[PDB]
């Protein structure tokens, strides 16, 4: 863990989750070098909004070379996603999350939910539940609109890698 890595992951978390500057809490870079059990940053998740959680997880891993671990928290009247580089109750396709409860998502967990490995990107949505201050967390896997477009783009991407 270092400063630029810290900047990198914070910026990417804003970009990938499409957050306002208001919606992300950042632990001090100096603090998190020394304490990996604290989170790099924590994102406010709006309800009814699709968030690219697999994409974000894989982004982190590609830069840390460490298996990341994000935690959904029901903090009482809000869900936050707390982003950890390492880890210290895991996600399924649909999840009930009550006040004080936590739900861990890793790449391994996404993997077990999703139906096929390739051409599949998993996202998530938070919904406000019928009664109480309880939220539901859906994980939803997405494919290409058109499989031709997608085969093409891969070939292009194969050609880029050097």
């Amino acid at each position: 863990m270092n400063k630029v890595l810290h900047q990198d992951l914070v910026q990417a978390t804003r970009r990938i989750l499409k957050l306002g500057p208001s919606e992300l809490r950042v632990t001090d870079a100096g603090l998190i070098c020394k304490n990996p059990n604290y989170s790099v940053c924590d994102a406010m998740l709006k309800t009814d909004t699709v968030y690219c959680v697999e994409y974000l997880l894989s982004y982190w891993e590609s830069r840390t070379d460490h298996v990341p671990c994000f935690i959904f928290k029901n903090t009482g009247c809000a869900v936050s996603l707390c982003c950890f580089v390492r880890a210290p109750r895991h996600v399924g396709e649909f999840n009930v999350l009550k006040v004080n409860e936590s739900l861990i998502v890793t790449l391994k967990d996404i993997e077990e939910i999703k139906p096929s490995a390739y051409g599949v990107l998993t996202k998530c949505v938070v919904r406000k539940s019928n009664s109480a201050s309880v939220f539901n967390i859906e994980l939803i896997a997405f494919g290409p609109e058109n499989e031709g477009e997608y085969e093409n783009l891969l070939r292009e991407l194969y050609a880029k890698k050097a």
Binding site: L121, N130, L157
Partner: protein
């Protein structure tokens, strides 16, 4: 290729990232089966219900391939107020009272009954409502004539809205029919209604329904 690789390429190729994430927009999960009877309060939001011989299915609207791209709870209110003018169009609703004055009165102090009908009727014309009371509180059972029943997510959240936490709303299959039961747990121009409905005839085609549905109806009264 892995997502790992994609990120390394996208850092240099932001044009390609855009195109990529724009194509990943077709839900391939969302559909799951469910158990009858199905309590609508205990359900997932923005999910349709698909009931057919083949399966009983909740499906996220993002994942629904039946509903294309309506009527509000508040809209059904305004039909409620003007039912006086739409009596022959809602003759199917009123057939449901079986010529009772007393039940018909009770539905004047219970808008969610009319509304929930109105909301389901917008979604499906092929329904046969029936009404009865326990302790002055009016109940309704909506019988679907067909085994293929799709209930859009929008109709559902709005039924739930119209029902407050007064009524239970429930879907079940009873004697070979899909039936939505609306069970009241608690609770303006009556006079012209009572008259116009007392004056309106019930035709032999409809009376055959109620005859064929007699034991179904007997079984729904509890």
């Amino acid at each position: 290729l892995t997502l790992h690789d994609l990120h390394d390429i996208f850092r240099e190729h932001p044009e390609l990232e855009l195109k990529y994430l724009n194509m990943m927009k077709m839900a391939i999960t969302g559909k799951e089966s469910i158990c009858l009877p199905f309590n609508f309060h205990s359900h997932r939001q923005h999910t349709c219900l698909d009931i057919s011989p083949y399966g009983n299915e909740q499906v996220s609207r993002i994942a629904c391939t039946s509903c294309e791209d309506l009527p509000t709870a508040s809209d059904a209110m305004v039909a409620f107020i003007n039912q006086t003018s739409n009596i022959m169009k809602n003759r199917n609703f009123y057939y449901g009272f079986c010529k009772s004055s007393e039940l018909l009165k009770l539905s004047t102090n219970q808008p969610p009954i009319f509304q929930i009908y109105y909301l389901l009727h917008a979604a499906n014309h092929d329904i046969v409502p029936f009404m009865h009371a326990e302790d002055g509180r009016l109940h309704m059972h909506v019988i679907f004539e067909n085994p293929d029943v799709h209930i859009p997510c929008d109709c559902i959240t709005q039924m739930l809205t119209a029902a407050r936490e007064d009524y239970s709303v429930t879907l079940n299959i009873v004697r070979d029919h899909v039936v939505i039961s609306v069970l009241c747990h608690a609770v303006i121009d009556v006079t012209i209604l009572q008259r116009k409905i007392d004056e309106m005839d019930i035709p032999n085609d409809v009376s055959e329904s109620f005859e064929r549905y007699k034991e179904l109806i007997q079984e729904l009264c509890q």
